[PDB]
């Protein structure tokens, strides 16, 4: 349930989340091409367990990540 | 060059912008269905001229708008 994505020229892989759960996918994005889908909880980012982290704490992980971002969902 | 959109259940019409210019479209969104496209400058929102407003000032207009949001682009 692990997806590898790559940031675009604006620094985004292409998803929106809330309460730990993916809610929207950006058109023409890495998230779109790699088949990330709404309504699933985020379990890991770059192999780190993020279950139970606050959205701002997940956002910090995402924003500070380098170009490649791997995400595991439940 | 005027598009009428409708906020979804998360309160979004489905676009990202920077420096007054649309940069991304959300999949399955009102912006997508109504044919908003990247790389154009935002001229008006709900009939108000926003040329020259800061991104935060455009964001306030968008966020405080009711359900229907009309946008004109150059």
């Amino acid at each position: 349930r692990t997806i590898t994505m790559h940031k675009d020229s604006t620094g985004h892989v292409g998803f929106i989340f809330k309460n730990g759960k993916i809610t929207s996918i950006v058109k023409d994005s890495s998230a779109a091409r790699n088949g990330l889908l709404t309504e699933h909880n985020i379990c890991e980012i770059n192999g780190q367990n993020v279950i139970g982290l606050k959205d701002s704490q997940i956002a910090d992980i995402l924003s500070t990540s380098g170009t490649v971002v791997t995400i595991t969902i439940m | 060059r005027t598009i009428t959109m409708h906020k979804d259940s998360t309160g979004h019409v489905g676009f990202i912008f920077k420096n007054g210019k649309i940069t991304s479209i959300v999949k399955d969104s009102s912006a997508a269905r109504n044919g908003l496209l990247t790389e154009h400058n935002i001229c008006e929102i709900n009939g108000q001229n926003v040329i020259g407003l800061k991104d935060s000032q455009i964001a306030d207009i968008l966020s405080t708008s009711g359900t229907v949001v009309t946008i004109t682009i150059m």
Partner: peptide, 4 residues
């Protein structure tokens, strides 16, 4: 909302 924020995009990532």
């Amino acid at each position: 909302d924020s995009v990532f």
